[PDB]
Structures are given as C-alpha cells and as structure tokens.
C-alpha cells in the first residue's frame, strides 16, 4: 500500500508545484530596473580585536550596538566592546568544541553548545561577580548547530538529531518539539515577530516553524546543495540563505517562492554566514574564498569586498542600528568594519 | 579616559594574561583524532591505553609527552559536518578491521572520503591494521580470501623489499592498496602512515609518538621553507 | 528541488545484461559526482561505483571490477550503469547518489543509511 501513499505525495507535490508557478507573473528583476544602483559602497577596517586562542566560529550582537559575544573552538567565550577594544568577560567552557553561542536579549544569559550535545547557559550578571554555570541542559543526541534566544525564560536549539526542541531555561525541558528537516540542522533565523522562526538544514530546505504551535507552515527546496546560513529580512517577511553551492537563494514568506538569486561565475567557495543590514539593501555574505561579498537585495550587484581576512570567514554579524559589521574567521582576529 | 577607562583596561590585561597562559597550557599538549566504523575494535585500543555525550576525550602521557586524543561518542552517519571542526590537529587515527572483508570497501571509501578532504588537506593520516591475527587465521584456514572480493589479488606480487607467506603477502597488497588510495591527489603537502596492530599489541604508543614527531617535523620544515 | 527518478530493474535471468538509467533534474549535472549504490536485504548500504563531474575520473568497486560501465551525458543530463554477467549475488536495490558540494574533488557520505539526495532505486533481482 506504500505505492499508493507515494502517487498521492507525488500529485500533492505536483498540485503545489503548479499552484505556485502561476503565481510567478514576474520576476524581481523586471521591475527593479528603474530604481538607481546602490554603488561600490567602501568599507574600512575601524576596530581589529585579536586574542582568541584558536578559529573564530560564532559571534552574536546584543540589545545594544556596543556589546558582543563570540565564541572560540578553545571552550572561551568571549564579551567585546567595540567602543573601548577592553575585553569584559571571558567564560572558560567545559568543552572545546562549541559550534554556536548566543546573546540574551535583556543581556543577562549567554548560551553555548556544540559536539558535546549539551546546550550551557551562564549568567552575566552573577551577584557572586565570577561566571557560575547557570543551566547546562542535555537530551539531544546530535551536536549543536544555533542556539537563539526567544525571552529571558525560553531559548531554542538546534541539533544534529533532526529533532529541534523549546527548551525553558527555569526547569531545562523540551516544551514543544517539531517533526524536523530530512538532514541534520544547519543554522536557524528568528522572525522580529518572535513568534515565528527559520530554520534551514543539509537538506536544501527552509522550514518556518511556530513557537506557539510546533509544526511547520511553509517549505522552500529551490536551493541544490547542504544550505549553512540562514538570515530573516528585518521586516520578516523574507529571509535569505546560503549554499555550498556559492548561491544564495532569497525566499519571502509571503510570496512563498524564490525571489532572487545571487551568484558570479568566479566565485565557486560555499557561503558560510549571512546578515542583513537595518534596511535591508546590503547582504553580506561569508565564503571560503578568504573574502566577504556585498550584495543588492534588488539589483543583485556586487557592492563590496572584504579582503581583511586570511581565512575562511567562519562568522559575520551586522549590528540592530547599522552602525559597524563584526566578521571573525578562522584566523582568530576579528575585524569590526564601517 | 577615567578611572572607569584605566579599570577597564587593567582587566582586559588581566584577561590578556589569562588567555597567554591558557594558550602556554594548549600548546605544551597535543590534540589527536580517533575514526572509525563501528565493525572496528577502537574501544579496545582506548581502553588499552592504560599508561549521550558526543564527543570523548582520553588523556594519556607518551615519552613525558601529553596526547588527548578526542572520539565521536554519539552522533549519526554523517561526517560531512563534524570534521571541519576537528581541523588543524596534529593526528588522526583511522582504525580499520582488516580481517572482516565486507566492511573492507566501506572503510576504503571512508579513507578516500576523508584523506582527499578540501579542508584537512594539511593533516596527515596514521592507519593501524588491527586484528592482525584473526585475519592470519581467516587467510590460513582457506574458506575465504580476498580473491574473490578484489580480482587485482590474482595478479599482486610479493615485493622484493614467524610468519606464513600468506599473511605476509596479504597484508603487504592491502598496504599498497592504501598507499595507491592515498597517492591519489595527495600533492605531497601530507603523507599518510600505515602500521600493524592487534588487540594485545602495547607499542602502539611508541608508533603514534614516533608518527607525531615525524609530522611536526614536516611542519617546521613546511614552516621553514615558507610553503 | 532536487528530484532523481529511476529507471529500468526488475527481474532478470542469469547471464543477462541491463542498463539502469538515473535522471537529475533542477542542477547541472556536469558539476557533481554521481555514484551508484547497492542495498543487499537485512544487509548495509555498500559504495558500487563512481563518475566524476567531467566523467574522467571514474571508480569501481572490487566485487564487480570490470563488470560494469558507467557514464554520463551532460547534455542529456543522464547517469547510464550498463551492466553485463549478472549473477545472483546481484539481487539488491540501486541507488543513484549526488555529492552535495560542486566542484570539489569527492564528497562525504556517498553510502550512507538515510541520505535526503538518494533516490528510491530500482529492485535488481536474478533467480532460477
């Protein structure tokens, strides 16, 4: 009877696929031909933090522009401040190999995780004044790929199990769980909603997932290779995501098909991390040809290059109000630009 | 500046200080990588080494020299992900049970897949071909050999350059084998290095020190030529 | 999306010879390594044979050495197994895989259990 179950799938897959070709009457090229081009914008190297023991794998700006946290494969956590250059924290992990790490949005909790398949939470502002391990929560069996946080009482995880959870960082249990992608989890992309989240995996899809209801609403498959960055469009309506395959696929929730594809016949590197600006005209994106690419959201022109790197750009993150651009790579310096 | 300013530039020479010890504390010891499919004895050769977590770290001392050698405890078939993490290492072990002939291919694949890897490209490989005995006792009794599994045996020599000459030539063809995968697109920026093993054998630790000397030595060389 | 639809199999006699067809759509096919499966019953996913994106570099598994032979048409876009001397241990599911990374040189998990860019594959089986 499975054959039967596989003809349905198929003419349902087939039925979506021709309800949504129909709603393509035009392409986002077509109709940004009259808007002006966005220009060679030059950027200039205005901090250069060094310090880091091993590569540089994840950074993540808080509430404010001033703060940030990065993480380091020597089990290090780091606090930068972009104004002062003086380093704030630094938390000694358990485990080296952390993949991830994430800022609390009141600036009160910094999570971490990675092969260990245990996601820790520390806190900040610890009234003893030295960083206490404040929730170290285990369950998966698979490593951690992005960690987010939601609230000062929620946060979610992703893993290489294929099964996400929301975890509460009160009593440090599963609170919803999804179905999952078909391949491991790569990289998840909060919603300024906060009531809906992105998350894309080796599977070359995207899925939208609820917080209130855990199942996915949406699903975008026109990528063709393992996608390893994820970033929402500041008003959240759309969200771009980067391959192996030096493409990057802008795919907008509303519309519900792919929009834009930026690609260059010389770059042949996969994109690593993907950030928005506060307008969202500027897409950064990171690939492992020791270089960093500006992109138009809607001439698809190169804007940009960032050549102050000597390795692959593992991480990069644009800051809530625009004013610098945090990239760390595996060379352990991290390079705060304009 | 203020008195907040000086303050603040204290503690971050504080924690520069920090971080230069903890940096002195990683370089005197030496990180390694443990593969392997599960039909393979590497739980023998960790516990050996008497002298849910996904990752698992055992420390040991080798000629006063510290090795923490780092396994994959719980995770799935995937691979692709996991091992540009464990990158710039000094050594990876890929342990191999060469007497079972089935899982033979799917642990040469494994070895092409990860030796002609993009990013470890500047790590070396050490292979160790355990079970060593029962694969002497397989080829003695006669019910199986690799005949029948690889046809290129009908045509393999003994090289010029205890024991049955059997097992000798059986084990001499599998090296080569390897040695032939390894070549292949190796660019000569990392050579491999194959050994015999078994369950029982204690000198493994002198291979392995020997195998990271010589590796650490390419590098000064490598760093010495300005590659 | 990456969709790979097969072709041919069945049941054949001893000493036939067949011809299994592998279809890639929504990717160019001349920039991806396209490796054929095998899938024994209550036994593991075992590597058969390799095609490189340019179909110079070509590899065989050792069971079936010179047995079979592999291609490619970039202008078609079609994978072809042409396989001669069947014997019974040939009795298997067969699988057409993709590497995910483009232009690079091999792939991890080109054997794996559960891989989101492997087909169903075609039922070869051979009895008397």
């Known amino acids: 009877e499975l054959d039967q179950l596989r003809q349905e799938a198929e003419q349902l897959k087939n039925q979506i696929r021709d309800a949504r070709k129909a709603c393509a009457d035009a392409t986002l090229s077509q109709i940004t031909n009259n808007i002006d081009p966005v220009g060679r914008i030059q950027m200039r190297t205005r901090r250069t933090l060094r310090g880091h023991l091993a590569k540089i794998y994840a950074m993540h700006w808080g509430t404010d522009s001033r703060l940030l946290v990065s993480a380091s494969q020597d089990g290090k956590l780091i606090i930068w401040d972009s104004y002062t250059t003086n380093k704030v924290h630094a938390i000694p992990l358990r485990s080296s190999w952390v993949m991830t790490c994430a800022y609390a949005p009141s600036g009160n909790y910094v999570a971490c995780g990675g092969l260990d398949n245990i996601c820790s939470i520390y806190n900040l502002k610890t009234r003893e004044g030295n960083v206490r391990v404040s929730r170290e929560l285990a369950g998966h069996t698979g490593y951690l790929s992005c960690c987010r946080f939601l609230d000062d009482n929620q946060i979610v995880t992703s893993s290489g199990d294929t099964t996400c959870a929301l975890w509460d960082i009160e009593t440090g249990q599963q609170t919803t769980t999804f179905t999952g992608h078909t391949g491991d989890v790569m990289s998840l992309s909060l919603a300024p909603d906060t009531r809906l989240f992105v998350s894309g995996a080796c599977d070359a899809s995207a899925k939208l997932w609820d917080v209130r209801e855990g199942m996915c609403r949406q699903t975008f498959t026109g990528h063709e290779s393992d996608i390893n960055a994820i970033c929402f469009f500041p008003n959240g309506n759309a969200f771009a995501t980067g391959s192996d395959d030096a493409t990057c696929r802008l795919f907008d929730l509303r519309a519900d098909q792919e929009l834009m594809t930026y690609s260059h016949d010389n770059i042949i590197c996969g994109i690593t991390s993907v950030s928005f600006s506060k307008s969202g005209r500027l897409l950064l994106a990171g690939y492992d040809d020791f270089n960093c690419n500006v992109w138009d959201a809607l001439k698809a022109d190169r804007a940009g290059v960032l050549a102050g790197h000597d390795n692959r750009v593992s991480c990069l993150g644009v800051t809530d109000d625009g004013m610098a651009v945090a990239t760390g790579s595996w060379d352990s310096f991290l390079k705060i630009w304009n | 500046l203020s008195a907040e300013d000086k303050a603040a530039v204290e503690r971050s020479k504080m924690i520069e200080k920090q971080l230069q010890k903890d940096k002195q504390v990683y370089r005197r010891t030496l990180r390694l990588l443990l593969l392997g499919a599960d039909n393979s004895g590497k739980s023998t050769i960790v516990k050996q080494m008497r002298i849910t977590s996904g990752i698992f770290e055992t420390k040991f001392q080798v000629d006063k020299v510290n090795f923490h050698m780092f396994d994959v405890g719980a995770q799935r078939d995937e691979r692709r992900k996991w091992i540009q993490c464990f990158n710039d290492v000094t050594a990876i072990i890929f342990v191999v049970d060469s007497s079972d002939y089935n899982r033979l291919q799917e642990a040469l694949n494994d070895f092409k897949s990860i030796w002609n890897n993009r990013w470890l490209r500047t790590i070396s490989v050490i292979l160790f071909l355990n079970k060593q005995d029962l694969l002497a006792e397989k080829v003695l009794a006669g019910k199986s050999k690799i005949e029948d599994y690889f046809p290129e045996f009908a045509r393999y020599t003994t090289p010029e350059d205890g024991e049955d000459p059997r097992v000798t030539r059986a084990k001499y063809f599998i090296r080569k084998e390897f040695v032939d995968i390894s070549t292949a697109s190796g660019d000569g920026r990392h050579i491999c290095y194959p050994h015999f093993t078994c369950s029982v054998d204690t000198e493994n630790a002198r291979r392995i020190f020997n195998d990271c000397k010589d590796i650490i030595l390419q590098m000064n060389l490598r760093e010495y030529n300005l590659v | 999306q990456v969709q790979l639809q097969e072709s041919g199999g069945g049941l054949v006699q001893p000493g036939g010879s067949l011809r299994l067809s592998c279809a890639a759509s929504?990717?160019?096919?001349?920039?991806?390594?396209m490796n054929w499966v095998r899938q024994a019953p209550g036994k593991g996913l075992e590597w058969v044979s390799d095609?490189?994106?340019?179909?110079?570099?070509?590899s065989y598994t050792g069971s079936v050495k010179g047995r079979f032979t592999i291609s490619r048409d970039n202008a078609k876009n079609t994978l072809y197994l042409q396989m001669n001397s069947l014997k019974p241990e040939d009795t298997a599911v067969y699988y057409c895989?993709?590497?995910?990374?483009?232009?690079?040189?091999?792939?991890?998990?080109?054997?794996?259990?559960?891989?989101?860019?492997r087909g169903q594959g075609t039922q070869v089986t051979v009895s008397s």
């Open positions: 929504g990717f160019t096919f001349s920039n991806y390594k």
């Open positions: 095609i490189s994106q340019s179909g110079a570099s070509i």
């Open positions: 895989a993709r590497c995910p990374a483009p232009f690079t040189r091999d792939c991890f998990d080109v054997t794996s259990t559960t891989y989101a860019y």
